[PDB]
Write a protein that binds this ligand. Structure first.
Ligand SMILES: C[C@H](CC(=O)O)CC(=O)Nc1nccs1
Lengths: 237, 300
């Protein structure tokens, strides 16, 4: 059934599973037209498909051409997401295919279930967790590949860099969701925290800076402070 | 006009014959039902006074044989049986008619209700949904499960309605996932009408039989089937115009006949609100929408 805080450790067991987040599939800017009407302009999007145990991210770039001449784009985007996730599962070798797919938004359940009819033993589940995967496009290297794409493209990344050499998957996922929540809540301040110190760099082959164990503790504390700070600003507390 | 005699009535029981019903007292001199209109299927149904558990009954057509009811004190129910000796049967009925021990099927002449509820229902199709080939009549009760219910347990005692499942490979062509899920026309017209039922008359017959079993026995799987068959049509963008017009007539008389006090359990809010107000066919069911809004405005 649904995935929540009671069964949170299930994310890090040895059953292959993927999170699917469709927030950034259909992305638009909204603008006035010459006649004073309003029009949307789509920009490139992405499906965020993540293995929370290993950090493997299958980021399918959604190029604006897929919307050309299509109607009801917000509805179509769910079906396109399901269409893309199902061919990724079909393409994966049998021993790599997930046993569960957890969608971050309940509107993805029926599209994904219908596209995965050929896989009756893959459980399609919602979650009660509020996960900040919409902020993936605040990770500079992910945003850059999406916006530079000129055609549909599948891009592979490990969203944990090399952290699993030193920490468990549970801790890596907790660090990831804290970083993404902070970038979602105050992007400018989060990036300031992550880069403020020029002597800590992002390796060419990484997404995040090369912090020591002690520096990650400091960074995580500053991210928690940011989130609390913004909550106080928001609710006047 | 034909006759279903009763050997006797040893236990107090409410007897239904189609949409009519009457109460028989324990050991009352009741010997059956006369003047049953030829040309339709019929259903004779029972609810025991001392145990309202198991509504049960028999679908039959007097054109196919001579049928009578006899109480079985071992199995504790009124059983339908066929009398093969025609002269014996006529003589029994005549005596009971002469002694005026039969109720008359109380049909008003202006009244087309039963025809309107059974227009497409044929005995031969009932006997394929309810499988007991040694009898010409079909037993149904409140607790019988459907084949689809059993898939989700005695297969001999099941209702073999046609399985409808909107999230199944039968309903969804590979490569047409969104199309077929949002517009069930493929599933309705190719899989169900052209493929399984062969024509809309057989589809409507099963729909009508499902409703009648839901209403007369409180059979829950029959209610599920009735709503699924409605939903499949209403959720299709492409439906022959004659089918929509006929569906409106079918549903109007079903809603008209439903007991007002059973609406909470016999009507699915989601299906009806979707069919009348959101579906492709939301504007094609004018008569049904009008009776639903005037009779059950709470459901909506
Ligand atoms: C359909 C998709 C390719 C595309 O989106 O054009 C499948 C895919 O990327 N398979 C993989 N297997 C291992 C790593 S990525």
């Amino acid at each position: 059934g649904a995935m929540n805080s009671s069964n949170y450790a299930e994310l890090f067991n040895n059953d292959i599973k993927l999170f699917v987040d469709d927030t950034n599939v259909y992305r638009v800017t909204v603008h006035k037209t010459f006649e004073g009407n309003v029009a949307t302009k789509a920009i490139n999007g992405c499906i965020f498909t993540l293995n929370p145990k290993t950090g493997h991210l299958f980021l399918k770039i959604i190029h604006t051409s897929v919307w050309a001449g299509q109607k009801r784009l917000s509805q179509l985007a769910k079906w396109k997401t399901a269409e893309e996730v199902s061919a990724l599962v079909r393409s994966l070798p049998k021993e790599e295919q997930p046993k569960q797919i957890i969608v971050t938004r309940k509107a993805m359940l029926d599209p994904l279930e219908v596209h995965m009819l050929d896989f009756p033993n893959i459980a399609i589940r919602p979650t009660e967790l509020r996960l900040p995967f919409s902020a993936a496009m605040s990770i500079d290297k992910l945003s850059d590949v999406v916006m530079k794409a000129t055609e549909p493209q599948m891009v592979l990344f490990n969203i944990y860099d090399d952290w699993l050499d030193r920490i468990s998957s549970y801790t890596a996922f907790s660090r990831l969701t804290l970083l993404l929540r902070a970038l979602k809540t105050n992007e400018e301040s989060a990036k300031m925290i992550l880069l403020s110190d020029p002597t800590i760099t992002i390796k060419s082959y990484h997404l995040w800076p090369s912090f020591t164990d002690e520096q990650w503790i400091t960074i995580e504390s500053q991210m928690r402070d940011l989130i609390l700070t913004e909550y106080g600003r928001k609710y006047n507390v | 006009m034909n006759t279903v005699p009763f050997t006797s009535a040893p236990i107090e029981v409410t007897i239904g014959i189609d949409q009519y019903s009457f109460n028989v007292k324990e050991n009352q001199p009741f010997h059956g039902i006369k003047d049953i209109p030829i040309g339709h299927v019929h259903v004779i149904h029972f609810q025991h006074a001392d145990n309202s558990s198991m509504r049960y009954g028999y679908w039959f057509d007097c054109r196919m044989g001579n049928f009578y009811i006899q109480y079985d004190p071992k199995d504790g129910l009124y059983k339908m049986m066929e009398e093969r000796d025609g002269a014996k049967f006529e003589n029994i009925v005549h005596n009971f008619k002469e002694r005026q021990m039969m109720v008359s099927y109380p049909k008003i002449d202006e009244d087309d209700t039963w025809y309107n509820l059974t227009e497409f229902v044929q005995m031969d199709k009932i006997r394929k949904i309810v499988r007991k080939d040694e009898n010409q009549f079909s037993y149904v009760d409140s607790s019988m499960t459907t084949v689809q219910e059993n898939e989700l347990s005695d297969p001999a005692h099941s209702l073999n309605y046609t399985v409808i499942n909107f999230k199944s490979r039968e309903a969804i062509r590979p490569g047409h996932e969104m199309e077929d899920f949002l517009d069930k026309s493929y599933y309705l017209n190719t899989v169900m009408l052209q493929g399984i039922f062969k024509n809309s008359s057989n589809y409507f017959g099963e729909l009508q039989f499902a409703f009648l079993n839901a209403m007369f026995f409180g059979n829950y799987g029959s209610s599920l089937q009735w709503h699924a068959m409605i939903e499949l049509i209403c959720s299709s963008a492409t439906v022959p115009k004659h089918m929509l017009d006929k569906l409106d007539e079918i549903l109007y008389y079903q809603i008209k006949t439903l007991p007002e006090q059973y609406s909470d359990i016999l009507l699915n809010e989601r299906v009806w609100n979707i069919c009348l107000y959101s579906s492709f066919q939301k504007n094609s069911l004018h008569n049904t929408e009008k009776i639903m809004e005037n009779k059950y405005p709470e459901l909506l």
